[PDB]
Amino acid sequence: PIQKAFLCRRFTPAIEAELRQRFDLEVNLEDTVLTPSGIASRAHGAEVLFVTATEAITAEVIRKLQPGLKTIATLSVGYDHIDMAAARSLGIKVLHTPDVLSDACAEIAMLLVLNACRRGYEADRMVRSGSWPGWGPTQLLGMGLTGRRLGIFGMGRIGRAIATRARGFGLAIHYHNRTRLSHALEEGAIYHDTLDSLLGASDIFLIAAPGRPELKGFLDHDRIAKIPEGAVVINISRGDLINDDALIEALRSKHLFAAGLDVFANEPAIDPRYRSLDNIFLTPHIGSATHETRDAMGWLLIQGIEALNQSDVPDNLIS
Amino acid sequence: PIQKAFLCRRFTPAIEAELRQRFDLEVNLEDTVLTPSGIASRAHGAEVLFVTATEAITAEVIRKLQPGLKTIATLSVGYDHIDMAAARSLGIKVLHTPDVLSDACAEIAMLLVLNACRRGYEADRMVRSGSWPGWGPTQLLGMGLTGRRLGIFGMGRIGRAIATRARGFGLAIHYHNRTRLSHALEEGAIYHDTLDSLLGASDIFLIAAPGRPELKGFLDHDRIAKIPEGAVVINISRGDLINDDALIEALRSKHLFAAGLDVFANEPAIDPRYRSLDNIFLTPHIGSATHETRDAMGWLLIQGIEALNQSDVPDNLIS
Amino acid sequence: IQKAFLCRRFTPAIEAELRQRFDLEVNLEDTVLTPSGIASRAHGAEVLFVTATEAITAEVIRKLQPGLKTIATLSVGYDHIDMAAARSLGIKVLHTPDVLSDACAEIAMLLVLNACRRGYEADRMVRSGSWPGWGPTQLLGMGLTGRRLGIFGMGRIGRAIATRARGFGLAIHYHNRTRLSHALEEGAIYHDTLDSLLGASDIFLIAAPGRPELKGFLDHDRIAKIPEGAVVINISRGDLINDDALIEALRSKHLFAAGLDVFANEPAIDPRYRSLDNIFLTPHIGSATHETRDAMGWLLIQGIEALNQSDVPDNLI
Amino acid sequence: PIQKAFLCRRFTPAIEAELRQRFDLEVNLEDTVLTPSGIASRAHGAEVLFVTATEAITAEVIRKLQPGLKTIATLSVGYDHIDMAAARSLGIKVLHTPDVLSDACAEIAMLLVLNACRRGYEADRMVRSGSWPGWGPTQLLGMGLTGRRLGIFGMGRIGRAIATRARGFGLAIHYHNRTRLSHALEEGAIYHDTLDSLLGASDIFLIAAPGRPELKGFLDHDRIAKIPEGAVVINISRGDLINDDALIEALRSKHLFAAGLDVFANEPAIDPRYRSLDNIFLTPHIGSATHETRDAMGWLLIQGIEALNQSDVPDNLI
Ligand SMILES: [Cl-]
Ligand SMILES: [Cl-]
Secondary structure, three states: OOOEEEEOOOOOHHHHHHHHHHOEEEEOOOOOOOOHHHHHHHHOOOOEEEEOOOOOEOHHHHHHOOOOOOEEEEOOOOOOOEOHHHHHHOOOEEEOOOOOOHHHHHHHHHHHHHHHHHOHHHHHHHHHHOOOOOOOOOOOOEOOOOOOEEEEEOOOHHHHHHHHHHHOOOOEEEEEOOOOOOHHHHOOOEEOOOHHHHHOOOOEEEEOOOOOHHHOOOEOHHHHHHOOOOEEEEEOOOHHHEOHHHHHHHHHHOOEEEEEEOOOOOOOOOOHHHHHOOOEEEOOOOOOOEHHHHHHHHHHHHHHHHHHHOOOOOOOEEO | OOOEEEEOOOOOHHHHHHHHHHOEEEEOOOOOOOOHHHHHHHOOOOOEEEEOOOOOEOHHHHHHOOOOOOEEEEOOOOOOOEOHHHHHHOOOEEEOOOOOOHHHHHHHHHHHHHHHHHOHHHHHHHHHOOOOOOOOOOOOOEOOOOOOEEEEEOOOHHHHHHHHHHHOOOOEEEEEOOOOOOHHHHOOOEEOOOHHHHHHOOOEEEEOOOOOHHHOOOEOHHHHHHOOOOEEEEEOOOHHHEOHHHHHHHHHHOOEEEEEEOOOOOOOOOOOOHHHOOOEEEOOOOOOOEHHHHHHHHHHHHHHHHHHHOOOOOOOEOO | OOEEEEOOOOOHHHHHHHHHHOEEEEOOOOOOOOHHHHHHHOOOOOEEEEOOOOOEOHHHHHHOOOOOOEEEEOOOOOOOEOHHHHHHOOOEEEOOOOOOHHHHHHHHHHHHHHHHHOHHHHHHHHHOOOOOOOOOOOOOEOOOOOOEEEEEOOOHHHHHHHHHHHOOOOEEEEEOOOOOOHHHHOOOEEOOOHHHHHHOOOEEEEOOOOOHHHOOOEOHHHHHHOOOOEEEEEOOOHHHEOHHHHHHHHHHOOEEEEEEOOOOOOOOOOOOHHHOOOEEEOOOOOOOEHHHHHHHHHHHHHHHHHHHOOOOOOOEO | OOOEEEEOOOOOHHHHHHHHHHOEEEEOOOOOOOOHHHHHHHHOOOOEEEEOOOOOEOHHHHHHOOOOOOEEEEOOOOOOOEOHHHHHHOOOEEEOOOOOOHHHHHHHHHHHHHHHHHOHHHHHHHHHHOOOOOOOOOOOOEOOOOOOEEEEEOOOHHHHHHHHHHHOOOOEEEEEOOOOOOHHHHOOOEEOOOHHHHHHOOOEEEEOOOOOHHHOOOEOHHHHHHOOOOEEEEEOOOHHHEOHHHHHHHHHOOOEEEEEEOOOOOOOOOOHHHHHOOOEEEOOOOOOOEHHHHHHHHHHHHHHHHHHHOOOOOOOEO
């Protein structure tokens, strides 16, 4: 029998066309970010809830949607936006999108590394300005990557994809995680026992840590001051891990050469000051935004639900 | 004895400090491009003339700088801008700076590849303009690198540095040179006997081939048509290799998904349509623009002059 | 896929791109349609192609509901569309900024050269068959070399005019509300007031876009501040000039000549202008090159394509 | 006591005032072009003859004006209209006006380029017509100068001043002269060792080559056919360099988009068809017509005579 589903954010048109045939589908047409009250209200009666990282699926949402709601399907690798304790207490099946976005995310990480080190914003702005004076020996001199140290805080699956790409540029890989990785995954990277030690060895300091309450605002005035003068900071994980005041102060003082951010505290209501910095490159949270990756994400949800409909265990089920 | 030198364009402060130590140095402080008449008047009396590819060193310049002028040292790989027939006839020694640009140039090639494929221009523009509505599943979908073919026209030292960096992103390397490379240098890239064969196999088509009269405007309507639909074109060699009309036309039909350019026909007076294309990233001929590479070039000249001063034959002496 | 309606003929080049991309219906006769004509003829279209000559009122927007989703105007400005009405309905509005400077600067120099060197009298004389032949005192004009060009509102269009003027040996003066960076000045002489600019202008040129504050600003008192024998050029908006004042000064010879591409109440211009020998007149053709009109069209095409893939183009109002 | 002088064409009032003060001056008040017999009739007795290019100073004229005539002063760069061998054989001093016209002439060339490319004639006619319907998206579209190639035939002093002004509009400069200019004078301009080569690469083809007999009618049917379709032709040098039949035909056939002409074969009796072409802008040989240029030319003649009166050797002596 055809399940009722509610779709909280607009997905790619190919995936939407499949969902319309596969479910009795109701769609959040204007693509707004619904509040938990909004979700509970709009989705009442749905058996399957299609969500993303922008939807706060709280314990209250999950309860209010009973007895209808059986499945939460999130178009994201992360799932901390879903109250998993509530979901599992009620036998709710939760699906996510593992092992399909690390290549795309690593591409954006490297785009930011390159744009920060080699001054991509100023570069493209200059050509389009109509005032480029032509080639000059001192025109937009950047930092070469060869021989420098890329320090990765939270070198998980996405972090390791970044390191693979980074090694090709002659970057020495340094990292800090709670636990040292095996040799197979480390691939020579230098393990630092503490964040302080990592910060002090990073010519480019990159945040790839998934992000946890304990990590909110961790990159602050004291910690930035520990990074060598002339370094670059990159963030591809979650914006609230960075103290915006601390970062913007360090960019203006030039203790940091430059930055590259794909994520921002309070996005899209990002700190207005970022937009007038010449030594930053900004990307609108497009880590996983390739045609192939976003389609693969949608298909993992569809395939997972097919598996639930046949009483099989989905590969992408979160316990 | 202590030689008078004239510097026609500013070099890095590090290199200028070395030159002041070794020469009675006069500098073109404002970093303007001196006309041949201006070079002759400003540099009169210099024994060593420090130049770049932006200085037109004509027969008349070399003659007007007699009898003082003995050495021209150019901060460039090429020496087309120096009348070598005149320099030979006056017994002038000419030095240049080959074979130290590959890492920096390869970083810019990858910067262009990533920004073209993942929409760096539209990304930064959107965030900076305050118009970003927030993360969404269909926002700025780009082309992933994994499972795609990078086709390199002219895979010499710079080309191979690009292939090294490209492999980390999961790009399969294809290339066309007149002659096939040795097994050692190939590292498994696929050789194409003809430029036509390479074009047809290129998801990303990259020009790293040095410019030649015969290659001027080779990338034209017919050759772009041979590239698979949805491809990306990158140019880091020289602008006049591309037919601007053909490139722009294909960026609009979407036969080409995007482009990345560091060099342009008639630079710095580039085609005025480029800046209005959303599917392009542009850099102002900054391929070799790292402190490390510009310093390395300066050191090749310094070492060359010291060799000449001892009556040695430097390896960077042009015949 | 999308239904579009085109209200005025565009270049054959752009119309071909539009037919390729849209189920396109065109106003073939190219007659300026009325708000009710538009609402009638456009019925069913998702995309509406317009120019500054189409009054896109609230009722046009409402009558084309529910099909109309996008208004694309071939113009920098958007006064002619009811933005409040569009905003309340979620309608996307696209315009074509920042691609007109080269073409407009060409018309500015055309007007400068024709006014100073008497192009109107020149062509009329040859064409009328009354030219007696070359003579050392025939149609003497004012050379540009060593003279001062004063540009009011020197933005992207102004700076493009300045680049071209420099080659003729004109010294550049300007007035903007805020001074430009030293690099963008290129040695131009800054005047912190308009009155100071007027006083130093051998050729006075209006490029300033023009708010309602500047309406009628070039009047009797301000023209009097310009050095006797000067030339006035206007390429911005007609109503910035007081016609009585300009005509009086052209007749008195306080001003040598003038060149105008724009006019108060156009195309119903002051009928006295056509009878002045010391003026050159162009019919608002500032941006009239194939390359520029096509460039504007491409901004719209690009904007719509971005909206279709759910992205936000830079030319969305 | 002071010199008798005859002035064959009206000069500017500032120059005539000065001439009446320095000479016993007789003037062709009517400003007609005097024939060789008319010049001999009017100027008899003159010691100084003030002329322009419109005066045919033949051997016959010079002998009829003997023994008085000892100085001929021409308000012009060229002196083709003066029989120099006749002048030399009688010890007659000739003065001309070199090197002061290029800026004024370059302005008219640019006026012509702009009016032709941007449809100045049609434009001004439309406004004055009373039937201008108002701004339209396809109203009087012309060709932008940015990125186009300006091809100059005979890039001399005048041609180089044109190139200076044209570079500002984003025009690429191409040229063909008999001999290639030095790198310093080229300033990057592209040299074609043949006219054919130049013609084939000119989006705007401009004639700045000073007139010589070899070149009469050079721009004909075959040569215009070599210019790319949709190009503009400009002439500020000499009218008889262009075959009028060829140019008019190519303008009507629209092989050429437009032309700008300051000079014309048989001027002032120009080909009547030119007047009915909408894709032409016409100027009545006003290349050098500014107050400053015409005054400067006049002062060169005056100063040169002053120098001869002091037994000194004037720069402008031929
Ligand atoms: Cl503009
Ligand atoms: Cl003058």
